[PDB]
Write a protein that binds this ligand. Structure first.
Ligand SMILES: COc1ccc2cc3[n+](cc2c1OC)CCc1cc2c(cc1-3)OCO2
Lengths: 186, 186
């Protein structure tokens, strides 16, 4: 459990103080742990942070696994997933500590590698919507991996680079894109 | 020069270290300048940054015009614009700096007031490529302004969230996208 308490106190610390700002001395004392132990488990603050990101991503995966019960067809699952990504980012705290981490440990192929292994988990989501949609012939795509990376990064920049518009607008652009994209696949 | 040897050091500094990573002291120091210089020409530091942005947005917008003849129809102009975006040296590079800086000053108003200013220069290249396309007959888009905004960001996502993998796979990815997209329009 001492492992988990470290993960827990860290997530919080990162939300309240940001990334570069949180210190491992803090992490160790607030988790009533030890420097030694922390090294044993994570080796670095960067990996500590990465581990968190896996666990969040694990929750998200799970979160969505239930929210999708209200999407009967895959066309639907595509529109809904794109939206949830847009809406649920507004009020998702970690988001700042991530932006702060990514725009730093970005130039390190070292971290950037573990970073991608993770970026794929968020990409498979689509991978599946497209596969299924295929079997249920909702469309007939055939390089689901390419189309999937395209969708994940398109959606992603709509989410990221539109922060200046008021939410009722962003959610409007996003649904349109889902249509134009989905449209261009048939 | 002096003032043109400052922007010269900021540009690069922002691109390397980050929006934060590079501090006022940094700039001026490696800029061989006085901390006052900044004051009369470059108001604030976020100002020196919001400056290098239009600089970049123009240099690129310009380079685009000089090469956009290679593309005969507007449908070709679409692929090409997106294609070149991946390879330019202008603007796109400090796209990270942007993200960081937007979330680090979004709780102010000189943000939307000037972001949207740079954001209208940005999505403009598509405005014309789509507008003309209507005139040209290559397609019919009623919401051009909308579509421009959407396209510009999906594309900025692809250019940005893929900077690490083989430069040629990007051009491939980007082109299957430009296709899926133009397809959804007609
Ligand atoms: C409401 O809760 C949310 C909402 C949204 C979340 C979004 C993401 N994660 C947790 C979330 C979460 O965790 C609880 C972790 C992994 C991830 C990788 C990404 C991405 C978004 C996310 O964009 C592209 O790469």
């Amino acid at each position: 459990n001492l492992k988990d308490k470290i993960l827990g106190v860290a997530k919080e610390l990162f939300i309240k103080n940001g990334y570069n700002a949180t210190t491992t001395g803090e992490i160790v004392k607030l988790s009533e742990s030890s420097k030694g132990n922390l090294y044993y488990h994570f080796k670095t603050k960067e990996n500590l942070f990465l581990e968190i990101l896996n666990i969040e991503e694990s929750k998200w995966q799970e979160q969505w696994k239930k929210e999708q019960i209200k999407a009967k067809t895959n066309r639907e699952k595509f529109y809904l997933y794109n939206e949830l990504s847009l809406t649920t980012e507004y009020y998702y705290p970690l988001q700042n500590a991530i932006i702060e981490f990514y725009t730093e440990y970005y130039k390190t192929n070292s971290i950037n590698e573990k970073m991608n292994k993770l970026e794929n988990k968020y990409i498979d989501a689509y991978h599946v919507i497209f596969k299924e949609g295929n079997l249920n012939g909702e469309w007939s795509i055939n390089d689901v991996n390419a189309v999937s990376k395209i969708a994940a990064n398109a959606v992603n920049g709509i989410v990221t680079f539109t922060h200046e518009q008021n939410i009722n607008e962003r959610i409007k652009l996003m649904n349109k894109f889902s249509q134009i994209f989905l449209n261009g696949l048939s």
